[PDB]
């Protein structure tokens, strides 16, 4: 016999994956999903996805097992930087903007968003951080905007060595695929190490 508790709603997964505009990479929006049923079928009838990689769990086994404390976070990255959203990679995004731990249990979903997150003669609303004193510890957000000094002379204001750390991907519609925008939603959750709060299809 299987006994699962009383439930009300169907989790706000549609409300995250289909929004008007996502957040920038340096200040990625993170949401919590709890006290609902998490059906991973509404994600499949969304887009012909570019990267759907799951670590620690099979994509087809996602409905009949359950878990706790799921975290969903979203951001918009450059085309050639999608492979950096993985445990154990390096680069500009993976060291200064968004780090995943080596032992990661979750999924990464990415799809093309050129028809919406791009305007003619520049779409300067999507920023990323390029200069930081040190690497980023897994799952840490740095929204600090302060002049970065890359020279011996102490920096007082923008100067030949003083550089603002945030640069803006210039999405434009005629670019090739490797520079085109991509929306990335990363789901993170813990398996069988805590009492469960969300499980999904009841019976």
């Amino acid at each position, epitope marked *: 016999i299987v006994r699962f508790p009383n439930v009300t709603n169907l989790c706000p997964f549609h409300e995250v994956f289909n929004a008007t505009r996502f957040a920038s990479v340096y200040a990625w929006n993170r949401t919590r999903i709890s006290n609902c049923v998490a059906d991973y079928s509404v994600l499949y009838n969304f887009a012909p996805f570019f990267a759907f990689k799951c670590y620690g769990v099979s994509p087809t086994k996602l409905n009949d097992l359950c878990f706790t404390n799921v975290y969903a976070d979203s951001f918009v990255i450059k085309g050639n930087e999608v492979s950096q959203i993985a445990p154990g990679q390096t680069g500009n995004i993976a060291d200064y903007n968004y780090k995943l731990p080596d032992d990661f249990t979750g999924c990464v979903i990415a799809w093309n968003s050129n028809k919406l997150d791009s305007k003619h003669s520049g779409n300067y609303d999507y920023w990323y951080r390029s200069f930081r004193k040190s690497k980023l510890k897994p799952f840490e957000r740095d929204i600090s905007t302060e002049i970065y000094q890359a020279g011996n002379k102490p920096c007082k204001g923008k100067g*030949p060595n*003083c550089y*603002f750390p945030l640069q803006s991907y*210039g999405f434009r519609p005629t670019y090739g695929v490797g520079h085109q925008p991509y929306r990335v939603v990363v789901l993170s959750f813990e398996l069988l190490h805590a009492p469960a709060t969300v499980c999904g299809p009841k019976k």
Partner: nanobody
Amino acid sequence: QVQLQESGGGLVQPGGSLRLSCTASGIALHTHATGWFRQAPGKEREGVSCISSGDGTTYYEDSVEGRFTISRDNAKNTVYLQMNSLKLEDTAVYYCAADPGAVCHSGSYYYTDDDFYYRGQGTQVTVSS
């Protein structure tokens, strides 16, 4: 506000040479894409050269191929245009512009579409007499 300042120009003679320089104040020209554009009187602006973000693939226009050389020094954060064997029709005013990303020749796009974000004041280059 990030500003780009040019330097150079003068009274060069046909067969001479000049080195135009463009120095930034707030951005690293090794993470942005730089370029040059020119204005002869009575005409419309046309590109000269470009460097991409990393390492740098140099692109040149048909009018100035083989004669001009584009290069960047990452210590002084200044891009250089070494112009060799200037002809009398090359008199114009030159502007340096920058844009985030490897903007020159990505896909079906090219830097002749004059839509860079950062730009400058310009320096007059004349060659005659």
